């Protein structure tokens, strides 16, 4: 009861789910945020001992407003220092001394270990999963990139799209709502609302059994299958030849 296709959409679904599990287990046990670990990973992997802030804003998928504070946190904690631009004085440059690059390196080595240990304790079934900080960074950026594309070219949310894709790969087979909810990382509220909107718009059928009214059946008829197919096809095109798993490094 999974996404039965080996395209880039499958990549997103797998990674998005992995990131959910990772966050769930790690965020409570560690005081440094995941975004903070990713910023440090980025900063570690690049030669200049000094860079323009706008370079970080452009290289990663985070909005600038979501970076300003974590830079402050990283600064406050001596991982980096900030210098004002001598040209457009409203701009900023981040500097990394030999002493700071060392504090960063150890911190990224810790992240490497956290990822490794998580993978060992996790149902690491797929080969997709990040193996170290650099890979984690890239795959995390892919989920953000995938999501931006969804809201730019479609009217559906990324959750509704996930659900549509999963059901579409069932080739007309009937799926039970509770089997669907059990298989995905998304919770009941979000899932049901996604299905109700998908039904309403006409993407799929959501009906109840007539003898065992307890079961909620989800599936698509010929027409709907066809449309969904085209749709998954368009999206896969949009993500075509982009080195989606290496948007930042390598």
Q: In Å, how far are 120, 132, 175 from 125, measured between CA atoms?
A: 10, 16, 23
Residue 16: how many CA atoms within 13 Å on its side-chain side?
18
User: Hey, what long-range contacts does 155-159 have (CB within 8 A, 24 or more apart)?
Assistant: 156/197, 156/198, 157/194, 159/186, 159/190, 159/191, 159/194
The domains found in the chain, sorted by start residue, are 1-127 (1.10.10.10), 128-250 (1.10.10.10)
Alpha carbons 231 and 222: distance in angstroms, whole number: 14
**Of 47, 63, 102, the residue nearest 80 (C-alpha):** 102
- Indicate which technique resolved this structure: X-ray
Q: What is the resolution of this structure in A?
A: 2.2
> In this structure, what are the phi and psi dihedrals at residue 119, rounded to the nearest 5 degrees?
-60, -35
């Amino acid at each position: 009861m999974k996404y039965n296709n080996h395209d880039k959409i499958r990549d997103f679904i797998i990674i998005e789910a992995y990131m959910f599990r990772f966050k769930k287990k790690v965020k409570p046990e560690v005081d440094m945020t995941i975004k903070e670990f990713i910023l440090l990973t980025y900063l570690f992997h690049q030669q200049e001992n000094t860079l323009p802030f706008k370079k970080i804003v452009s290289d990663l998928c985070y909005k600038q407003s979501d970076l300003v504070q974590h830079i402050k946190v990283l600064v406050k904690h001596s991982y980096i220092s900030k210098v004002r631009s001598k040209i457009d004085e409203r701009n900023t440059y981040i500097s990394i001394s030999e002493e700071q690059r060392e504090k960063i390196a150890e911190r990224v080595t810790l992240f490497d270990q956290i990822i490794k240990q998580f993978n060992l304790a996790d149902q690491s079934e797929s080969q997709m999963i990040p193996k170290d900080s650099k890979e984690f960074l890239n795959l995390m950026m892919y989920t953000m990139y995938f999501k931006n594309i969804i809201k730019k070219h479609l009217t559906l949310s990324f959750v509704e799209f996930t659900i549509l894709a999963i059901i579409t790969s069932q080739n007309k087979n009937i799926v039970l709502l509770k089997d669907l909810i059990e298989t995905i990382h998304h919770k009941y509220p979000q899932t049901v609302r996604a299905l109700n909107n998908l039904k309403k718009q006409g993407y799929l059928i959501k009906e109840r059994s007539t003898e065992d009214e307890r079961k909620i059946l989800i599936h698509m008829d010929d027409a709907q299958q066809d449309h969904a197919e085209q749709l998954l096809a368009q999206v896969n095109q949009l993500l075509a030849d982009k080195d989606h798993l290496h948007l930042v490094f390598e």
